[PDB]
């Protein structure tokens, strides 16, 4: 009956560590990817239904969908992150599995371009993330029935928003939902390889830490940096 998301869930503000370094810097790429990962998880924690599920269930959910959540965030933040510049630099350090990583990079580029071409807005991205977060398809979850109802509310709220905001674009909702399968064509293992493993990082292991961290000290350090 009541809504899954509020207008508060539209805000998704990534702070990059600095302007693009002159030369390939793996630390800058991973720091930027890690800020996006932290923001995606801190955004999920802001949803009342997510908090209501409890720590066991909501850790299992993120462990199952983090790569899809993270990739929607890559598409949303592509301009802010200069993602096109970052992917080019990885392809070159690569070219100077190998061919798996290349196909993955190509899939990520095509996904990010498909979302830009549709002008996906902040509301549409929040609902798309909620639809991937509350997917009942994953074999781990315990409480399929309740997660299914949360996913159905996200779908209904996205349709109402698209009908109210883009009334003349009859086919927009269908166009946006047919982007979601593209997220599952991208291996979480390769995302981890491309943006994290190197700096030695299992995302599955650190997810519980990110979900429990106090965000005040973290956000102060991010915002108070040069």
């Amino acid at each position: 009956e009541g809504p899954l998301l509020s207008d508060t869930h539209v805000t998704f503000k990534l702070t990059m560590p600095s302007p693009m370094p002159e030369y390939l810097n793996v630390h800058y790429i991973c720091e930027s990817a890690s800020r996006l990962l932290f923001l995606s998880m801190h955004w999920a924690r802001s949803i009342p239904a997510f908090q209501a599920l409890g720590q066991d269930c909501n850790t299992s959910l993120v462990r199952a969908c983090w790569n899809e959540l993270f990739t929607l965030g890559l598409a949303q933040c592509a301009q802010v992150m200069s993602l096109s510049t970052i992917l080019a630099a990885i392809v070159n350090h690569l070219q100077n599995r190998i061919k798996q990583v290349m196909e993955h990079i190509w899939k990520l580029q095509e996904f990010c371009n498909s979302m830009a071409k549709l002008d996906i807005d902040g509301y549409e991205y929040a609902y798309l993330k909620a639809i991937v977060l509350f997917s009942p398809d994953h074999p781990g979850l315990t409480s399929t029935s309740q997660i299914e109802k949360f996913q159905e509310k996200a779908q209904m709220e996205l349709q109402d928003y698209v009908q109210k905001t883009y009334s003349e674009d009859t086919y927009r909702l269908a166009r946006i939902l047919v982007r979601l399968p593209a997220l599952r064509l991208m291996s979480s293992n390769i995302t981890e390889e491309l943006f994290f493993t190197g700096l030695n990082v299992s995302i599955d292991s650190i997810i519980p830490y990110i979900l429990k961290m106090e965000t005040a000290e973290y956000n102060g350090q991010i915002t108070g940096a040069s």
Binding site: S18, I210, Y218
Partner: peptide
């Protein structure tokens, strides 16, 4: 202007804690 590796420093702490706790 200059990067502060805030998120990397948290991840380094999380990794270190998880390795102690398991294996």
């Amino acid at each position: 202007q200059q990067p502060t590796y805030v998120a990397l420093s948290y991840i380094n702490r999380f990794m270190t804690d998880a390795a102690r706790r398991e294996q």
